[PDB]
Amino acid sequence: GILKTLSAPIILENSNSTFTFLPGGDNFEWIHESIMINAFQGNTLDGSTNNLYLRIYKDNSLAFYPLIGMNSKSTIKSGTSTLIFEGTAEDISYTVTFRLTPYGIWFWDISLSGNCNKADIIYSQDIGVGTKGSVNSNELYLAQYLGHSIFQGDYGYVICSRQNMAQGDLFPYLQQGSLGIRSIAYSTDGTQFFGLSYKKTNIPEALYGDLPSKNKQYELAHTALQTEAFSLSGTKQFSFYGICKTNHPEVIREIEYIQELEKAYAYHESGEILPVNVPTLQNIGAPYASSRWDAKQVEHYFPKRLLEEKEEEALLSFFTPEKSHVVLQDKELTTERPHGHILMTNFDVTKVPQGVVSSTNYMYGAFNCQFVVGNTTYNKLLSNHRGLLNIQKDSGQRIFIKIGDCYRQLTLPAAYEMNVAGSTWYYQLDEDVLIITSFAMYNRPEIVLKVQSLGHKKYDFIVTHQLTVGPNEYENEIKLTREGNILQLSPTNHFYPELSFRMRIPEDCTLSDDSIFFHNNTTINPSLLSIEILQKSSFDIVMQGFDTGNVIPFLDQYDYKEQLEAYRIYYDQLVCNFKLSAPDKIPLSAEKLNAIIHWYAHDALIHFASPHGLEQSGGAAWGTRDVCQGPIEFFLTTGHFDLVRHILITLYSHQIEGGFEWPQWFMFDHYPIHQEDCHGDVVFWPLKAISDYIQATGDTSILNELVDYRTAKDALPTNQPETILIHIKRAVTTIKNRYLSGTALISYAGGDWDDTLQPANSELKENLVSAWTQALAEQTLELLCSAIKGIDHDFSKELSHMANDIRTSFYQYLIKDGVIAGFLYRESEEHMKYMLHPDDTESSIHYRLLPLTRSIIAQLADFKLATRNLEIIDEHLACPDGVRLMDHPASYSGGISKIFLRAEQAANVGREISLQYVHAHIRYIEALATMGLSKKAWDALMRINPILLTDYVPNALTRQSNVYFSSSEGCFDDRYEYAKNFDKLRTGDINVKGGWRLYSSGPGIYIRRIIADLLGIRFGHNVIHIDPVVTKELDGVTLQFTCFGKTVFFTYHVDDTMDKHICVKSNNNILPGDNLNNIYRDGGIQIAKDVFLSAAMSDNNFHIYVKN
Ligand SMILES: O=P(O)(O)O[C@H]1O[C@H](CO)[C@@H](O)[C@H](O)[C@H]1O
């Protein structure tokens, strides 16, 4: 059976514009030239995000009626470039005429005829304003760079918008406003229009009130305009309009295109505008959100709770002894980002895995989005989740349940419980609880949905699936065969020709597309795979993925518990059975590490094996710098050494021929895709990681492995392998080649760690020097020197000379008045200027975090400089929510870049522009740990710990507690208010909120901080290093940890009165060893493996005595 693709059947066209609609008149794709104007494509069940709302005010009510789209019940006529919507609302006849003119200008002309006392209109439009590619790739990210300027025009508010991230060279533009009626209020983000409450009510919150008239620069670019209120007794007429320009290189300063708009307003098409058939839903109601559980219900279903989060004494979330995190309804209605989770199949932990299965789900009834097998972009069965508020709610796997006469789509449950192996939703019904579980199979490429009525009551269900079978919805035809209760789905390819999926469905279910939702049984979307299941108290759908066609029979039985238990052991072993305990009350911070470790282990494992996140659904590839940080640090900390060796070989095989640097990112599977343009820090990371591998393992053989390169343009193997050592030599030449003349100052080139600080021109590219890059290069080439020492003496000597020269240029050029400058700009020896240093008095930015922490971490900063670094942090960068990247925001003047690219283009205060990018705060922790500053280090660890965050950082707004957040951003509506009131961040006088979730190096590098740097357990070549940096409160606390395959119990004692720094005892015998080198403090102890293990055979409780 062949599934066709959805094509939007209403197709309006006019000079350089194609605007398409679904048959209910819902927006599909509005394209002007090559710019997509809307943010979200409509779907055949929900319609589209945009609308026009008629509201009617009475003495005891307010009513609101959508005028367009399939939720309006308007009839429709169309021409070549016109739609006419007609209908009535109470006592008002309306017509809405949509005009697509030749000018990249559209109108919604509204005519109202009737009697009523008080009415208004609300205009509502989601806006993307990017290429189709950019909008589809990430709506949220596109929104971040879409800057809105508000003016008063002839008819009140007019919203102008400039897209500040280049779209195929161009900076596109929108303008929206009203004609013939005053817009008396406006909003610019979907959070303002729909509100968080939408996630329960399914009703846009703004419809009950006035728009706020504030420009909120967030992630749901969404323009709303509210008319002045009016009486009706007769006919009233007015319009809304939009203008799209594909290139507006200047910043917005005023309302433009007034003459053009007047010309476009006079435009009407000559052709007949004729009736078209409009489909209508049949027995489909409003969505069903659960009633909220009260205290006694929660107590009943979850008798065993820990780490309870409460606000105003209402329970928001908690953890359980069985390693679950549970989220109550009320919490989801207070988090701006939607609670969600990623499931992933276990793999062999000694090799780079292939064909890993994964699925994403969210608390608000998105049960399974983006089911993939291997490649998280291309090898996909179910469509991606999009947005934040579930306005469009048809993606992936959804469930309809019959309540009374009507099928009703499940949205918000009473509770959502996550475990690393699965997600459970609890929906309160009338005298029943419906329990939905979506869970991963152990050892099998499967995700299973289970639906179960707690009281064994029967119901009718339709389970819908937005298929892709490929990277995108609506892109390709689908082969669907059915044998009994097994469906097989495959595309109708080049690198995964056997790609297929199977679903086992319940035994007397019926199969359709969206036809069953409609009165006429008309198919509109043929790729909506619908499963109607009648009169069942329970059922399941088993979903299998096969990237290489290794099809396996279904099991008879699919049991969540067994999977849960197998994954729990997998995760325990993954973190070497980490567990903190004490005889007395364990400290809260330890309790937080026990609860978070396996969650961060899961997040890190996803980042490694199945690279994608919640907001960042588009991934698939390894980032070169990323795989060297998050996964490698996680795996080196936990002794997954064979895995790191394999990672590193794969990594080196992706080095690019000719240029001999690395791509920014690359697919690690059979898809030859990479980004050959890289930032200037990227080359250092494979060099550092291989060195850290060699130091940890003694495995110098890796340097003799014969490994290929990839071609720049095609990402194909070059079939000219060389030893990894020679790979390294070539990389190192590229570094030497970046010396500025007369110096060993490494050119900035494409940028450093901070992806928002790409150089805005060629001169800045050539002549900037990043102090962080410089420090990283020094550290990397020193580590390289040591790692290669025993193998190639001469190269090791050259590496030493290089590191030394880089060190000398660092001290000689990048430091003034004891302050390490963020950057030096050097045209030549005669023309030099510090930036991100106090001397740059023309700039607002005088201090940069990155070099301060890298220089400490590398032991490059001498003790004095390192101590100065910490003072600079305390005085200029430390905030209650963590340490900031800079002491002031980057420039923003309407979106054109001057020095830095994306940092100067982002309209939204978020991601790196927030200045608290958590990854960098974790490096701060690493630096503190190097300096032995245990009180600052543990305090910093807690400030970014999502568990009970709001109890610890009073101005932090709550967020999902069992997942990593990548940034912390002040609640500032725009860049100008951010700059003006920046100091509020330092004193906690503005609230801060969480950024993007899960997909980051953060969780892995956090885990390393915990284990290696603070608890102080590090593995070396036939040695264990013991070097705790802990507080008095860890005194009497024990870490259980598996060391070289042996479970040990490290009990901490903090003794300020010791003669020595460190002492390690087993059965009262002091373990012999050597002190570690550390220029800032007394070093830890290196104990031989055989000695350590021998001691552990008799008494595996090791007592560590440490003085701060
Ligand atoms: O969001 P993440 O993964 O924590 O980190 C992201 O931003 C950082 C700062 O620009 C980069 O160094 C990473 O390569 C990128 O993935």
Fold and architecture overview:
With 1108 residues, the chain is α+β, with helices and mostly antiparallel strands. The chain has a domain at 575-1007: Glycosyltransferase (Alpha/alpha barrel). 24% of the residues lie in helices and 30% in strands. It contains 27 helices and 60 strands. The strands form 13 sheets. Strands 6, 7, 8, 9, 10, 11, 12, 13, 14, 15, 16, 17 and 18 form a 13-stranded antiparallel sheet that branches. Strand 28 (422-429) and strand 29 (432-440) form a beta hairpin. The structure holds 1-O-phosphono-alpha-D-glucopyranose. 1-O-phosphono-alpha-D-glucopyranose binds next to helix 10. 1-O-phosphono-alpha-D-glucopyranose (G1P) binds next to helix 10.
